[PDB]
Structures are given as C-alpha cells and as structure tokens.
Amino acid sequence: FTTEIHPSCVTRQKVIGAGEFGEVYKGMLKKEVPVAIKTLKAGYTEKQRVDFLGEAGIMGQFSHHNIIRLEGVISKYKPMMIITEYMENGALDKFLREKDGEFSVLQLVGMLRGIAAGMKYLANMNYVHRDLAARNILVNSNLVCKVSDFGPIRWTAPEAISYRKFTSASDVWSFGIVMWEVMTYGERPYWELSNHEVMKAINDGFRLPTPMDCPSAIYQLMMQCWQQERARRPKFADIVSILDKLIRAPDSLKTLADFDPRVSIRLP
C-alpha cells in the first residue's frame, strides 16, 4: 500500500515545474515539513492515471537514501496528488550549471557515489530506469543526489538505440554520461553534434574526452561504462565499490587525467 494523505494536510505554495497534465509544487505537509507535490487534474485518461499512480506505486516500493522518498498520495479526492520529500536545490543538471567551479573534486565524486548507490539499488530491485541523466537527478541541501523520474539519444547506450534493449547495463552507459556531466559542471554531452552525428561517432569508436580537472581514476571508470559490448561494462556494484574506495582514500583523486585543450594560447 501507499500512505493516503488528506488534502487539508497539504498546502501548495509555489509552482516549480511540469504542466499540461498537472504541475509540481513546493509546499508544506502537516511542525509542518517541506514537500514537493505533483497533481493530476480533471479529465486525465486511464493511461495517465495508471502512469501517475504507477509512479507513486513504484516509488512506494523503494526505501533508499539516494531514491526520492514518497510521503504519500491523495487518491480519494480530486485533484489527485503525489507528495514526496522536497529537494531544495532542484535538478542536478541546472544546479551544476549555476554553480560552475564551486565544488571540490571530492564533493563531485561524492555526488556520483550517491547516484551510483541509488542505481545499484534500482538495478538489484530489477528496475531499469531507461532515462538516467543529470536532468532526472534531484539535489537536496546536504548535496545528496537522488534518482527521480520513475514510471534522449546522447545519454543512451548503443543497444538501446539500435534495438530497444534497455537493461541495467544500458543504465550503466547512461551513468557514465552522468559522471561526465557532473565532472564538467553540466556540459552538454557531445556539444553541438546532432543526434545522428553522436550515434555515428559512438559507432566509430569515439568517446567523450576527459573533463578539465578530472581524476584519472574517474575518467577511466566512465570510459569503462562506455564499452560497446554490454557484457564488458562494470555492474553498478563495481561502480559503487570503486567510488567508495576513491572517496575513502581521497589523495587518489589528486592524480588527474591529461586534459586535451582545444585552444592554444602562447605568451612570449
């Protein structure tokens, strides 16, 4: 089951997202606690209802630090609502772009370990995410990153593009892209390349280059996430283990991969 919340306990305060089938609000739940609130407004279809309550059902089956926590649902009254913990810093991709250069390498790798721990939990629960990307991670005031969006060519593994094979191993590919997004403070993967140019480049063997100021071990790990052969990629358990060891021995992050500069500045 899922906890049913009475609408008198829910106060919507500000719109923070979505729209056209409902909105996402910041609000308070009854001292009161901050929550996020997603609505499903009148006229919703049967498929929208099973998708809406399905997301709440899927989230209600999970209990992990790096997975968005469900507070409850409003299903007996209209509009229906999903109420979750409130993540004060919003989506990770936008967050990183607005905080460019403001974190330590150790902080950035800690964000990746949390995302990986969430993904290990999901994969072991037999949940394939299919849309892992910094835009679908949320960040709270403890800098904890949590996977969201339960129920994008340049985040997607080749086998998922080519023949629709989505597995935890294609989520691992996506996690490698997320690593690159985090270490670059939200750079767009493959910059201005078109979707067709990205697929072509990947098939030809090209991979995203090293971010600036990126630990050698971190670049090596994202490169292994991008193995063409699915069976050669690390499992999330391997990823979590490696990230944990690097954080525990933080001097290991001071060895940087060489950064290939695109622009030559020479001063006499």
Ligand X SMILES: Cc1cccc(Cl)c1NC(=O)c1cnc(Nc2cc(N3CCOCC3)cc(S(C)(=O)=O)c2)s1
User: Which residues of this chain interact with ligand X, rule CB under 6 A?
Assistant: 16-17, 24, 36-38, 55, 68, 82, 84, 86-87, 90-91, 138, 148
- Complex with ligand X: residue 38 or 233, whichever CB lies closer: 38
| Contact of 52 with 44, CB cutoff 8 Å | yes
- Complex with ligand X: residue 91 or 169, whichever CB lies closer: 91
Q: What is the H or E stretch that residue 158 is in?
A: helix 158-163
Tokens of 106: 């150790």
CB of 184 to ligand X, least distance (A): 19
Catalytic-role residue among 51, 93, 131, 260? 131
CB of 93 to ligand X, least distance (A): 9
- Complex with ligand X: residue 132 or 169, whichever CB lies closer: 132
- Complex with ligand X: residue 60 or 250, whichever CB lies closer: 60
- Distance CA(10)–CA(92), nearest Å, equals 26
CB of 177 to ligand X, least distance (A): 18
Angle in degrees, 0-180, between the axes of helices 236-248 and 105-124, rounded to the nearest 10: 150
Position of tokens 């919703």?
44
213 in catalytic set: no
Residues tagged in the binding site annotation: 16-24, 38
The pair phi, psi for residue 164, each rounded to 5°, is: 65, 30
- Distance CA(184)–CA(127), nearest Å, equals 28
Tokens of 47: 């498929």
CB of 92 to ligand X, least distance (A): 9
- Distance CA(230)–CA(221), nearest Å, equals 15
With helix as H, strand as E and coil as C, how does 64-107 read? CCCECCEEEEECCCCCEEEEEECCCCCEHHHHHHHCCCCCCHHH
Catalytic (active-site) positions:
131
